[PDB]
Amino acid sequence: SGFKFLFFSPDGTLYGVHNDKLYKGTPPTSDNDNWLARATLIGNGGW
Amino acid sequence: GFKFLFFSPDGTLYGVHNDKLYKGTPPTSDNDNWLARATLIGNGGW
Amino acid sequence: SGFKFLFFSPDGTLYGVHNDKLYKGTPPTSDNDNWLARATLIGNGGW
Amino acid sequence: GFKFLFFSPDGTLYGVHNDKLYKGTPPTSDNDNWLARATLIGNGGW
Amino acid sequence: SGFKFLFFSPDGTLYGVHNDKLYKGTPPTSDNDNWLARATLIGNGGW
Ligand SMILES: CC(=O)N[C@@H]1[C@@H](O)[C@H](O)[C@@H](CO)O[C@@H]1O
Ligand SMILES: CC(=O)N[C@@H]1[C@@H](O)[C@H](O)[C@@H](CO)O[C@H]1O
Ligand SMILES: CC(=O)N[C@@H]1[C@@H](O)[C@H](O)[C@@H](CO)O[C@H]1O
Ligand SMILES: CC(=O)N[C@@H]1[C@@H](O)[C@H](O)[C@@H](CO)O[C@H]1O
Ligand SMILES: CC(=O)N[C@@H]1[C@@H](O)[C@H](O)[C@@H](CO)O[C@H]1O
Numbered sequence: 075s076g077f078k079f080l081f082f083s084p085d086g087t088l089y090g091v092h093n094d095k096l097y098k099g100t101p102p103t104s105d106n107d108n109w110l111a112r113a114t115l116i117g118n119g120g121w
Numbered sequence: 122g123f124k125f126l127f128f129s130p131d132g133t134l135y136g137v138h139n140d141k142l143y144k145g146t147p148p149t150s151d152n153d154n155w156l157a158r159a160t161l162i163g164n165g166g167w
Numbered sequence: 168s169g170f171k172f173l174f175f176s177p178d179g180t181l182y183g184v185h186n187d188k189l190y191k192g193t194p195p196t197s198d199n200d201n202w203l204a205r206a207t208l209i210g211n212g213g214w
Numbered sequence: 215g216f217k218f219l220f221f222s223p224d225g226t227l228y229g230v231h232n233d234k235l236y237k238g239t240p241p242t243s244d245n246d247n248w249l250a251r252a253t254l255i256g257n258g259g260w
Numbered sequence: 261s262g263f264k265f266l267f268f269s270p271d272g273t274l275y276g277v278h279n280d281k282l283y284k285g286t287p288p289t290s291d292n293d294n295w296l297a298r299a300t301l302i303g304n305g306g307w
Contacts (some may be wrong), residue, residue: 076167079219080125094215105164118244121215122214126172151211169307198304199265218266257291260262
């Protein structure tokens with residue numbers, strides 16, 4: 075369930091591994107922000 | 122407990138607790154109830 | 168046994184969850200340095 | 215997949231995969247096979 | 261086997277928990293760099 079990894083790059087971008095895939099994006103600022111729907115897909119598997 | 126607990130480079134503490142994502146300035150003593158004051162920035166899926 | 172989380176803040180302070188409690192302190196530079204005995208207790212439970 | 219995955223403060227991605235330590239600039243798109251180009255910086259023991 | 265935690269300080273030093281002990285050092289630069297053999301032991305137990 076949820077993320078396997080969740081962490082920041084030093085430039086303040088949020089990265090996460092979810093369902094073996096890698097995502098990044100600006101971190102959310104309220105629970106109304108669906109982060110995973112807007113996050114940039116940057117790895118399609120293997121994570 | 123928390124599943125993830127980690128800093129942003131601007132020094133904000135982030136944690137995932139009960140599937141929810143929270144941020145806040147880090148607690149400064151054993152009297153500081155972090156979860157009661159942290160900003161809820163995601164509810165579910167974390 | 169040991170810590171559940173152990174990570175840095177961006178100013179160089181070491182943070183750690185140990186026995187569900189949160190601690191912080193300047194990291195040790197030798198194994199003679201009992202870090203947990205000097206660390207600041209910043210959370211008494213729930214971590 | 216990875217056992218650890220994390221940044222160095224200069225912006226380089228580090229990962230432990232199959233006991234090995236790898237680093238490299240993070241991927242920009244899912245067309246980028248990161249593990250295939252990452253620099254192997256440790257062969258075992260991670 | 262391997263490490264329980266592996267992470268950076270903001271000054272670029274690699275830290276690792278290995279067999280309950282805390283180590284630090286410049287990150288390895290190649291597979292010919294035996295890191296654990298040259299890392300600085302900074303904690304002998306409890307991690
Ligand atoms: C761990 C890793 O490098 N995985 C990459 C994946 O993210 C990328 O989408 C693909 C491009 O073909 O090459 C991989 O499998
Ligand atoms: C992992 C993730 O992105 N979870 C978000 C959640 O935090 C947010 O509360 C919800 C409604 O906006 O949308 C979810 O998808
Ligand atoms: C996870 C969290 O916020 N834990 C805090 C704890 O560290 C603090 O000692 C107490 C009241 O002081 O409030 C708790 O629940
Ligand atoms: C954890 C660690 O230090 N592992 C190193 C490995 O990365 C390196 O490839 C090898 C030969 O130099 O020495 C091992 O001890
Ligand atoms: C987690 C912690 O602080 N462990 C310390 C250890 O690194 C140090 O070698 C020792 C010296 O007495 O004090 C230990 O218990």
